[PDB]
Amino acid sequence: FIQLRLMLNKLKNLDNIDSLTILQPFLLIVSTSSISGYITSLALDSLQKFFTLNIINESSQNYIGAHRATVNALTHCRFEGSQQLSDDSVLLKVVFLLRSIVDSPYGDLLSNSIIYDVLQTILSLACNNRRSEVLRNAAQSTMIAVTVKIFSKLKTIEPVNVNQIYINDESYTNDVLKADTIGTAYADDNYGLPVVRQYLNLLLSLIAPENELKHSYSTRIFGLELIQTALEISGDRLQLYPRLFTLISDPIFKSILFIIQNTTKLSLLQATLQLFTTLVVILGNNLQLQIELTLTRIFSILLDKPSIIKELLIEQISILWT
Amino acid sequence: VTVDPVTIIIKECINLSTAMRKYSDPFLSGFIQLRLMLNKLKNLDNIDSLTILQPFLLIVSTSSISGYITSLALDSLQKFFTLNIINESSQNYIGAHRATVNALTHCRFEGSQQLSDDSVLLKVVFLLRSIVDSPYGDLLSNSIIYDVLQTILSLACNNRRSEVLRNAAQSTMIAVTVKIFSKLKTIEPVNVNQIYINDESYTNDVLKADTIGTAYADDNYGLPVVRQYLNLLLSLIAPENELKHSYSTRIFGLELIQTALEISGDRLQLYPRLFTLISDPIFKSILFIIQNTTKLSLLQATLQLFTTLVVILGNNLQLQIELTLTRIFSILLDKPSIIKELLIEQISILWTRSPSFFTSTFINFDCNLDRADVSINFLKALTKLALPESALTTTESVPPICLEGLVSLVDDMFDHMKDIDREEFGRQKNEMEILKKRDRKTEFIECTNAFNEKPKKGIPMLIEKGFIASDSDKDIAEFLFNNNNRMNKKTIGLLLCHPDKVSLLNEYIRLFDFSGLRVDEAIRILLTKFRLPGESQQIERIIEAFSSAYCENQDYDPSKISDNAEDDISTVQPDADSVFILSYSIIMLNTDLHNPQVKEHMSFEDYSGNLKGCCNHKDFPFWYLDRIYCSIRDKEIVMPEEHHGNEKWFEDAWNNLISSTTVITESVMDKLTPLELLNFDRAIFKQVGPSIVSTLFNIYVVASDDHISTRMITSLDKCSYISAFFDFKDLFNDILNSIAK
Amino acid sequence: ELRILILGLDGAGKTTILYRLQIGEVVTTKPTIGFNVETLSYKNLKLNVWDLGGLTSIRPYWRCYYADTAAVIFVVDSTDKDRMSTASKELHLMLQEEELQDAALLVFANKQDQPGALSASEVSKELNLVELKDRSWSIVASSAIKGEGITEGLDWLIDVIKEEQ
Amino acid sequence: ELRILILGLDGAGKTTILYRLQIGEVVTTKPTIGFNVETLSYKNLKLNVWDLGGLTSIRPYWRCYYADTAAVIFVVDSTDKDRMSTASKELHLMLQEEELQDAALLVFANKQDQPGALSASEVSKELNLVELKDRSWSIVASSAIKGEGITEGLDWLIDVIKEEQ
């Protein structure tokens, strides 16, 4: 800090000064452990002030790298403390700064690995039962905003090829949600399809029959809501991208059918039926065998269970023929 | 957004209806009606958005539903806003968004324990932040934005809520403040060339209670909400409500003001109301906190705001900066050590972050007479604090900072000397008139003291020793008009009214500007720089002169429009005695409405009554009497030389020194050649050179680290070069002889 | 034990009428968008009064509130004669709603105390109030800022409510 | 309680050296932006090691990190010798620091496996290590993926540390 002050003393503007040099002490004191909660809170406040008042911008050296380093520091924010309210406040600052960065052009200039790390961090916060409630709600809101931004950016990239034939050879069991270590085309490019594919694979991992007992009901409902928001933002353009459509068709519809057929919880069934009817309305001309099988199973259920399941099914299917 | 919005709205209606049915009547019926209405549709071509949003808004605003149903409604509205269901191309979208913000501001529910309440209020805060940040927030109104500001600020300044909710509210406040003042950055300047009379009252916007939980308004928001927001922020940090706000609230208000200044910049000068709020009361509160506080965090926030003001708006806050710096130097040279360390560091932020701080201060102050010496006093204080003797009994971190300041002065002086061609600098034979008049400052102080004790001796002294062109009445009037910052103003009142001086009085009063102003503003500008005498005849003479001048300087026309006119130029034409009577009425109403000793007040009734028959023997129009009455009820007439002594003294000092000069509102480095800059450097070096050289030698001798010694020897080398350049033979000999020894 | 509904177009002083009934004062009220509910203890009987906004975007929401309604106060606006046709159409829709049939209709027209005020007989005939059948029908002109007629209308309403039981 | 400061430009392989010291297994290394600390002990003395990265924006903080340091490692990428002059200038500046007078300039010429690896003698001559003011000169080649000179360099460092006292 003292050296940065000496470097910046009596300089009219940050013309030749590299932005990463400006931000490095703050990022170092954010990412490293053994630094108390108060100091990392102050550092996060300083970073947020430097972002709300645009300081590292299009006319500064290594601004792409500066914002990438800021996000990399944020995704590994670790600190010590005595109470839990301080931890919640620091993590709320982290989540807010991430939401600000991603929803800006400088967020659009980030990397595939960086965006995937942001997704994993915020999802770990939003699916951890050991945090508070306000922190989890903030994390969930941030996840919904980031999902909307990512799939909106999806609706500008042309498909890789419209004449070639896609063969499903990429495995689904590759991405699993990581532990919450925060608190106490290829990568290195402007993010595009690869991060979208990884994100959809992670969302599939949240809601899957093989991963049923390793996730709570809240996590699965949140994953279904995220997939539904992704579909609603994206639209009928998801069929031009073969990998995203395969993930929607085979595994995600398998998960929807499994939950519809073998679940007793009402909230999970409601989320699953909402996603199913959204899929039928939006992408129904390309998913016919799946809709046939799901409708046949639903009619089997209705014509043979405290009957509140049946009322839920009949309402969420009635949304169809209107 | 390519999906049909109808299915989203119907799905939200279905989920809310199911939730209400499970929890458990009019609200459920409204949702069923909306479901049917939208089911019999295919697109939102001619269905108003308010109808689509109304059941959700009722759930949000009605204080008879659980937090679960309210949270569901908030989630539905956030889903609509994220998906942009109410687009630019939808009917009544402005009304829909204004209604949804109104519903959020008055959100109420009867809920479970505090966790659910915090979750719901967080949802409200997030939705407000999203709406304001979008252009749909740019289409909101002044009243709606003020309600948003009040709600978020009350949440952020409430000690009965979770820290997470408070932090979220604080972040939202910072974002909204940035948005508002960024809009201010590019709107328009109104009445650039028209003078401003300070009539607004600073005590009309107070923070409301935290009731959430358990041009003009109705127009796109612009300047009015910015003014109201600055007024509320002033109320947070005001001196007169220290007991009503915690320290966290005051710190947050200071941070909000600083963020607003950083976002706006040097454009608050164009807007007179905002700059008046920044100049008089906000700076008054800053100085009060600096002088009369004991907590370090509040002092740090106050000093940071003060230095931001000095860096940005320093060319228009000169008297305030002089007063605050003088108080700071009085503090630093007489409070625990930690306070002094905080002051010296946050003031150290100045001389590094200014083009040439000491030179600019010496140009503005210490040369313009009637202003106390600030640059020389600053340098002397820094030199006295730099020695280890001042390190004793104070903080150990002060002397290095003061030494940094002195070395910065030397380095800046050297930088103004890189390529000046010393021979050509000496070639000058005509010294600047500024320095020539500066050398005679002590004589001016003696003459001003003589004038204060008795004008009969002051005037001949003020004409014999210069400082006045000639003994003519016009010259005396001009000098009293302009140069009165240190001249006593009660003496001006008692001299400008003595019967023999009826010529100087007439010229002085004619020297004002009164074109286009009502009687209220004319009286404000007359009493701004002139204290009324005590005797009735003296006040009569001054008021007679003022009335004559106001009528002569406001040439009227026979139009004589009566009533139905908010104009104030061609509408009222008081001849000469009408002005006399109205001015006496204004002066009396000032005391009547602002004397707390007298019970009750003189209302408008019979105040309009015992005035009819003056303006050509008729009554003044309703607009004029109402306007003067309001302008006296608010913003009591500022007068000079209130009273000096014990008890309330800071208020009097601020009134006399700043509020008198801030009633009417209308750098130099870029305007001077390098040679003039070096001339000012020569003057300041002559004044403060031996002290700096001696201080550097003391530090160098007593030091032990190599870096300190190297830096001090380099500074002494630069001092030797400066001495050689300006031909300061004694100082050059001193420096080199001490180095040789 | 009574549910009095105040319905009318925007600008009829419905909120002012409600506040004058509740406390008896002139209160400046902004244009409401949802609803406001207060109670009255004018007689030994305690009645709960629901006030609804009058904008074009909320009238179907009025249509939702018609449940266990004992009386309806259809305050009308005594100016802007071009809006009288729309007011009459809305009144006919409310009357033919098949739920408010077993109620009593009362009209105030509080805008009589202004220049160009329409005659009570004139508006009653123009609004086809005489075409009403099998329902109580009585209008009482009044001034919201002053009053006088408000007490008369409330007296008639409470008398007919007593006669109902 | 020994202090070891692993410096060197980007791509030199400092993280690989630290990983080989700590676990003796080759692990993929991401470009470091801050620092890595893994206190170790070779035989009987604790080895607190601080690793610093390049990226051409952290060298001022390299200067900041010099504090109570007796061991200095200056791994220089043997491949791409155009950047070697910058490393020479940086190590000269590090030596010129007053707080590292009692240090021991040790350099590992890593990436010997890559083609065209510069000769150790020529590299040391380009570093003009003979101009050191009687501090040290321990240019020892090594490899990161495989252990060729890492053990010898560690032996040299621990031997000079033992010879200190």
Ligand SMILES: Nc1nc2c(ncn2[C@@H]2O[C@H](COP(=O)(O)OP(=O)(O)OP(=O)(O)O)[C@@H](O)[C@H]2O)c(=O)[nH]1
């Ligand atoms: N001068 C005058 N104005 C009245 C009177 N009664 C009502 N008003 C007007 O009514 C306005 C108050 O609004 P509301 O009482 O809410 O009118 P409303 O019929 O309920 O319609 P909404 O505003 O949409 O709720 C005031 O601004 C007055 O202008 C009256 O007796 N005299």
Ligand SMILES: Nc1nc2c(ncn2[C@@H]2O[C@H](COP(=O)(O)OP(=O)(O)OP(=O)(O)O)[C@@H](O)[C@H]2O)c(=O)[nH]1
């Ligand atoms: N295969 C092989 N690779 C080596 C060898 N020495 C160095 N490397 C390369 O050096 C890299 C080591 O990364 P780091 O030590 O983190 O590089 P750094 O000094 O931290 O600089 P940055 O990566 O920019 O932070 C590896 O990715 C290797 O590719 C070696 O001996 N064999």
